[PDB]
Amino acid sequence: EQIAVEYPIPTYRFVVSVGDEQIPFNNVSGLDVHYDVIEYKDGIG
């Protein structure tokens, strides 16, 4: 009983601080982590 449901956080409820001061921004993007892929192949498969 009492199934609990949670919804994701809205995207507009964010606060940005640069250095040690808070600056009201309008849009922040690009916080991505990217790793290269190294591949090695042998003759036997």
Next chain:
Amino acid sequence: AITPEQIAVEYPIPTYRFVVSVGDEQIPFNNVSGLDVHYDVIEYKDGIG
């Protein structure tokens, strides 16, 4: 309509799947090359052609 046996019999073989044995042991490898046979050429010319 071509069956896999027909491909095994008549089609050419690719060059990416191979096994290498060194002495009495098998060692995986990434690239093998240089398996060439070369002969020298001996020439002799006559005065009449």
